[model samples]
Target chain A: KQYIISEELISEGKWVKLEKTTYMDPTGKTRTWESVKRTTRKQTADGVAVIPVLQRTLHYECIVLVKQFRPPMGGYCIEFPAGLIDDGETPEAAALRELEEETGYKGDIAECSPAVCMDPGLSNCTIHIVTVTINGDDAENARPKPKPGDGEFVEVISLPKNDLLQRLDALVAEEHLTVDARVYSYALALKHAN
Target chain B: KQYIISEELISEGKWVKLEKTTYMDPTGKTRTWESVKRTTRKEQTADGVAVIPVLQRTLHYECIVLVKQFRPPMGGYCIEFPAGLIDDGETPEAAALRELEEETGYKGDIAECSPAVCMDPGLSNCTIHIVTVTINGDDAENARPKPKPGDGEFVEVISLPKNDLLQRLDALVAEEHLTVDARVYSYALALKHA
Candidate 1:
């Protein structure tokens, strides 16, 4: 087991901080590990996270994906409808809100994996993998939509569940869309489907 | 269209940086965006890669090998595919092969390598290229790997049936309280449906 001895702030920001943490390794040796801490509104609370909205109609099951020009990547990334949970909001509520705001699809939570940290080696941000269901009648209405928010440009696309892996590959080769791992993972499952 | 106005470094570390960026939106509007960045140390760049190794022993059963370790940021154990950051002058495929052997003592050839994929674009400029490796040679029990991880590493190798990956992941999270990485979780979903 490891024990935290102390922590020193290497740097701080509105959303993230670089820290030097001194801890006792399992072998009883003292080591200083540099890590990052991500928080919301300067509060050290558990950050809320959400993932893709899995929408199914009477005919076929599809995944709701968004293509957006993210500044960091300096290009477009295809990802699930996800966001942080706002103050006093439940993860389910946040999931629904983010789904509608990002994809224009009003969905209900079919299932939610408890909050899990994606890249713990880099940061401490956590997100819930939520599967959302939208009615068949409402699927088409969600797309051909507007920008989710100002400075946040997103184009919504509905990908059929069948042959999803190939579809994603085509999108990457033809459109240069960077696939999100979560989205790609679900596509892999669909590929192996009987 | 968006145009960058300027950028200011809030803080810099060997691995990451906190920066404030000012940009102009399409409507002649200016805004400041704060972000954290993971860098490739060689220069001030944000290019890194990760891989997912799939060990296929038989037609009916493909095994996915994952590593369990204590990630300091989460202050808990995280179960994820054997992954690592690519080194300078190394191809992502080579990195995948090296990391696979180093972390799990298994060697495999690349069946397919995905294009660069983003984890969370909104958070940082961390992109990973996932390589799917298929083990070579006979499917003897001795061909299976034993953990021989490197320094400061406390890794336990766990192999799961490809079809039962998602179900087992659910148990790991719900029963064991282990945090699942987003990409790992998504890939498991693909395995489940596949």
Candidate 2:
């Protein structure tokens, strides 16, 4: 639309919500568009996703991923460790917290991205992408118990950086699990870059 | 959870809709989750297609072209690749080319296509094809504009060097305060990692 006029809430639940937007078109016509959004979003951000890289060898690195059943897809999704940012928490802090909660691996921050859109066409959700490193040589990193509290069911998988795409493909094609776009995009780019 | 038990519609609008899902957790506990989804998905495996256009210039130099537009959800200008929802019976590859030409005014061959990838599994069931296109800058036709977007579409095309994307995006974020899409951000990160 040429310009947006207003966004009115259509419905709201505990966390999920929808809105109807009024905007002016190029022909000076009024149009309404329906969109979904999150009610839990704070000024800091909505959520944070962390890419925890485990360095096991001098020349090798592996990425730790989480797999779980996402109700929206009606299928299991393999993704980076991610979760919503609780109130008063910074994205950097949220990233480390979620990574530890989901993978049971405490790691230091390597890089953090600005808040970015998740599904712009579907919802106004945003998440900060953060990368962390796990020193595999450390004794504490040996045993991990991913804390999946409440109704959670999460499994962690670490894959070598080399041929990551093909490995994910095998999991998707043979094992029949869906891969999240952010994780798949990163893997594809890693291969392309090298 | 391993599988879904049932999904009941909570609310529905023109495009976006909300649903409540009941599923059995791995621990045999009954759980409920709420999510958002598109109401118009058809037999097509994907709902939309996102095109990554790489413009090959002189001296083996290449750049990635992006579309800068005001996204209603973000309430700000977002830097992203060309993308659009697929027509009911249209193939994702077809939609990729159509959206790429319509948004960026540049036509290119599909160099690579990714499998179905989920955008935001945490909140919505949105999936799209991430298709890569190779554009030859030497082509005379590529110089002129072929843009005639729909009534509600207003687009500004941007091109950034492939090798300099990550830092360039960070600089732009600091200087112009533009929000970047997760796909674009991951692509830049991949380049950085490489």
Candidate 3:
């Protein structure tokens, strides 16, 4: 069993509950880390969040897509509107809804693929690959709202795919991305546009 | 974001506890999944429990070795003691102790091997690969405890490496040789000494 409970609130001009968890672990016994279930309260991230990179569709360019995260690492993960999964929402619904709200894009998502970092032993979370093909051109219909409260930060930057690889050490040196995440993203992008 | 917590408790024959959890849903509303957790409190057979193979030395005639449960579609079938992480009570110290108790006829040998990577993506626990070398003389040392709940099975069935790997797809790991590699080395020695 696990043994720890932590509750913290995030303040982005407004205070909101970030995450609360309970670990129940005694010193000895079968090695199972169980977490007592609890509700996650609402949180806020107000004003001036970092926007993601938007790569030019063609050549010497990069795009700004959000690297949404999944805790179970079991659900979908791909380019989606930047937002966190609400406490009880299915990952696909959350992704589609977030993508529509943030990017003003509406699409019907079919299935979520299982594609974690090449080596999960050294990493955490079994990342799932999410796929969404445009279902409707509702970008003109949907309007972007203030970003929701997710456990993610949206970054708006520009860098070539090749450059991203070349200067990877520098970017990682800056602690902007996790090594495994970067590697996963690269693997995903390698099959991009096909 | 996770909704269910399920576990089966057979060892001590306990009752499963049912639990309920609540959370805020994406509709800006609260949702609750009542009775989302279930525990299975029953005695499990060795077949019911998780048991992977524990193949050790495969040199000349392949000394004591665990069977390798593998398939093309799925990399590794379930393993018994494929050696990996060290648990809380199953520490290096306790492991040494267990080895002594398991090997009634062990001689003077103390060769340790490094841990290996598990290419399988299933089960989430630590198993180990233990190998020992000894000199040629010794009477029985009764300093070991009687085998725990699962020791006699080890000597009874011993590993049949070839047959084990042959019917890879449709075989459940047996009980007697649950830790059957001891006989594997014995078989190897017989072949060599013959």
Candidate 4:
């Protein structure tokens, strides 16, 4: 598969770390790249994270999302239910766990895209793109009453099915909120909505 | 308005720097987070730009292009849109056009470009401006695509029918076991647009 010559742990923190990895490419070139490594409760383990794109099926037609203040962006970001896949845990499990934990909604995985990399040019972290739909029977009970995870104060929002893109645009243009790339792409997908 | 308490450089690399940042949240909470910043950039504007190109053939057949590359981090081939970092003073549209040409040898005019959006706000400050372009025809004079190796890595450019992208992507995951980039996968389920 892959060969690693050396790994220099540049810096390690509670959540993330910086590492310089020197490896030999398939063409036998010595290439070195800096990887922004992230860790969860299980430290030093390598694997993929999970991002749940949840759509509420209980309501007529809506999407489940979270708005939380991200220090990196210095503002509230509208994002999907997401988290790291814990050690020995599958991406599907992580998606469901994070979704319920962040939005207090139970959903079933409609599709779990193969693990995808977030920003491969800058980091080594990979994530599972999970598409989730609500359990119709549990809709009312599963309605969002968020009890965000530690260090997070999340506001759960349900986007209108017919007007998802414009509503998010208004949130950004008028409310000055930042939207995550994944969710923003959702708006782009809605441009030609019928 | 955001207040930054401090930023400490933890590690430096050729392209990225790891930093620990202490900032005050909207709720007046002081928190520390690690962020990865690009080093060789004019500023932290948009880290890069990507284009989703849609091509039509004589029979009204539509297809989209995807690039396959061996990403060292995941130790696997990743299927993604043709994208590259924005050089100093380069506009997002210019960068998107350049990257599309360089990566896939296809020239196109950008139709629409979205604002910069963060992929992982919890992990890094990396953002990408996404652009959509329509190729007149697959056999058009400027629509010819060939994978041009760059920076010592070999890339394979793939073009698939627009309607079958999601199906093919699913097969790529189930059978080929390749990781797809989030933005690229976004288009697969980009329902109304496709």
Candidate 5:
């Protein structure tokens, strides 16, 4: 229904470029959009090569990556450890890599029947849910942090999966974790128990 | 942690321009994403100024529009509406108005809670789920056109409503829907019906 009347590249900044695009309105056939860069390439989702990336909230024991003060919504939220594909990284590899990098849990990444964290309507980005199985000691002692190269300041706070779920429910009631992926991750981890 | 090292722009085409980005390495820390000219600005999930906009499938409806066929197992899917935030529009009103126009079959130029779909995510770029609420005679007589306005396609079809849970159950088994939203849709719909 949205049509591009024409487009031209104006300035390619250091990190990104800008484009001036024009489009014909759906009905009036007169309305159009300009300025924003819709894309920076001549490729389509189908034509471009994509890496299959997966994110796992490994439940060898669920840990809450506590987030506070949702400035946008003015609340707090609890989240899990997740990451994207590292080029040739497979799901288990990325899961393991992300697990250690994000959670600081040194363990084997096991491929469970991964469920999608979110899909079917909000994102073209794909997410696969994988699990990391750990022994008692490893599970008990594991404390994850964002890696140096990937540092984003993630702190590991261990909690019983059930309690975590309860907390997530509270957040949900408070309107946090309302996004599909966060909500899905919460529901999956909540029902998940050792 | 993905970083971009440098970029090169090429303007040798008529319809579109191209950018070749240099990253940390071919397979190292840095990577390039082709930022192309946006065709239509996606609307925000809620009303306001937002940086990044995302769509999230609600848990109430059993509705899911899915697409299969991609490499890597994760490629087997994702759950999302054909949505984009209105980045190019002059105002949120324009963006919301634009997205609703492009994605759903609702007729021209309107914005209100009446047409607003419900969406609220805790930490996500998602805010609203704008959709066409079809009453008895509101279903589009014709399927949405292919080669859609943007590089988007109407891939799958299903609906989620309160009274048709049996259908949702049946479809789940049939692989009619596999993303996380199917169950959430059903749950959310029950509440809506209540």
Candidate 6:
């Protein structure tokens, strides 16, 4: 069994921070490791990733994705419509807000994955993957107009479920876009489906 | 079309640094974003390599290898695939092989490799290559892996049935109160389609 003894901050940033943790190993030895963390003054999940799928027919299913310029990577990234959970907001609650804000389409959450960290070795950032359903026959969603703030630059794209991997491949190779790990891994899993 | 105007350092650590970027969006409006980045990687093809090892047991009893370890960022045990950064001058594929051995003592063949993908676009600039590996579990030498994790590393390797991936993982999550890594959880979800 492992137990944490103490965690101390090394450097603090405006939005992120670094820390060194001392812990007791199963072998009864003390060890230290550095971890990345967020400086969220208030939060449940660090964020919620909304996987909005438009379904009218089994053959006409589409997955909604967003292409936004991420300053950290210095490129446009293709990802689910995800955003941070506001203070006092629940995971599923944030999912609907972010989905509507980014994709401009109302959705009902069909399911939600447990809190999962993106990169365990590097950071503790975690998010809930909420799968949402949008009726393709809905009148309000015929043409979802983007609603981005002055500082936000989000472009929405809806692709056939099977064409996700192929489109993401082209974007990365030809358009120089970054694809999020969740999106890539999800596509990889579907590709191997028998 | 987003163009970077300037990126200034906010804080720097031995392995990580934070920066604030100013950029001009497609609408010709300027915006600022704060992002965390790794201080390493100049010639590295990727920051790390993760192995998704598939074991061929009985024709009807295939499985995958996963490790449970206490992650500092998580402040709890996390179930995930074996992964490690590529050491100096090593191919990511090589890193996947060595890490798979060191973490779970499983000698497997690399079935395929995906191009590097971002882990957390909102947090860090870390990218990783997902390596699919196949192991002949029935071989005399492959009966059971004798994992010899090095130095500060202490992992409990476990193999779970391939067909019941999600439910099994969830049961473990409840029994041990363990956290699930996003990478592994996505693979589990995709398995439903297979």
Pick the TM-score winner: 2
**Models sorted by lDDT, best on top:** 2, 6, 4, 1, 5, 3
Q: Which stretches of candidate 4 lie over 4 Å from their true place?
A: A1-5, A25-27, A41-60, A135-143, A192-194, B1-3, B25-27, B147-149, B192-194
Q: Which regions of candidate 5 are displaced past 4 Å?
A: A1-77, A112-123, A139-146, A169-180, A183-185, A188-194, B1-124, B128-194
The C-alpha TM-scores of every prediction are 0.88, 0.96, 0.29, 0.87, 0.40, 0.94
- Candidate 2 regions with alpha-carbon error over 4 angstroms: A1-3, A24-29
Q: Write the per-residue lDDT of candidate 5 for residues B1-194, one digit (tens) a residue.
A: 23346555543233233455544432355444343322222443443221111112344332323222211112233333334454633445555444433444322232222112222222122344333222222235323423234543333323443345335533663673344333243233222222
Q: Write the per-residue lDDT of candidate 1 for residues B147-173, one digit (tens) a residue.
A: 566778777788777768878878877
- The predicted structure with the larger DockQ, 1 or 2, is 2
Best lDDT among the predictions, by candidate number: 2
If you assessed candidate 1 against the hidden native complex, which CAPRI class would it receive?
medium
**Fraction of true A-B contacts recovered by candidate 2:** 0.62
Model 1 Cα lDDT, one tens digit per residue, A1-194: 86568878998777678887777768888877667776573322244333443544555567768887666555678888777777777778878887878777776777766666767777777787776667646646544243376566667777777767788899999986788766776675565444
lDDT of 3: 0.29
Q: Clashes per prediction?
A: 5, 1, 38, 0, 41, 0
Model 4's chain B yields a TM-score of 0.89
Candidate 4: pairs in clash: none
The C-alpha stretches of model 1 lying farther than 4 A from their native spots are A41-60, A138-150, A192-194, B41-47, B58-60, B136-144
The best candidate by DockQ is: 2
Position A20, candidate 5: lDDT: 49
> DockQ of each model against the real complex?
0.53, 0.68, 0.03, 0.53, 0.09, 0.68
Worst 10 residues of 4 chain B by lDDT: B185-194
DockQ winner, 4 or 5: 4
Q: Sort the predicted structures by TM-score, highest score first.
A: 2, 6, 1, 4, 5, 3
Model 3 has a DockQ score of 0.03
lDDT of 5 at B17: 38
Between prediction 5 and prediction 6, the one with superior lDDT is 6
